[PDB]
Amino acid sequence: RGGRLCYCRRRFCVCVGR
Amino acid sequence: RGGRLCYCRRRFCVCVGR
């Protein structure tokens, strides 16, 4: 959808539009 | 925009609507 942010779960970052 | 799919580049996954 609209928006963006990345989060790191241990040693892997993940980026989504939510 | 419309649609959704997620891809991984090494140990980092991204998700977008394009």
UniProtKB/Swiss-Prot annotation, chains A, B:
Family: Belongs to the cathelicidin family.
Function as written in the Swiss-Prot or TrEMBL entry: Microbicidal activity. Active against E.coli, Listeria monocytogenes and C.albicans, in vitro.
Disulfide bonds: 6-15, 8-13
Organism phylogeny: Eukaryota, Metazoa, Chordata, Craniata, Vertebrata
Organism superkingdom: Eukaryota
UniProt subcellular location: Secreted
Listed name of the protein: Protegrin-1
Arginine amide PTM sites in chain numbering: 18
Originating organism: Sus scrofa (Pig)
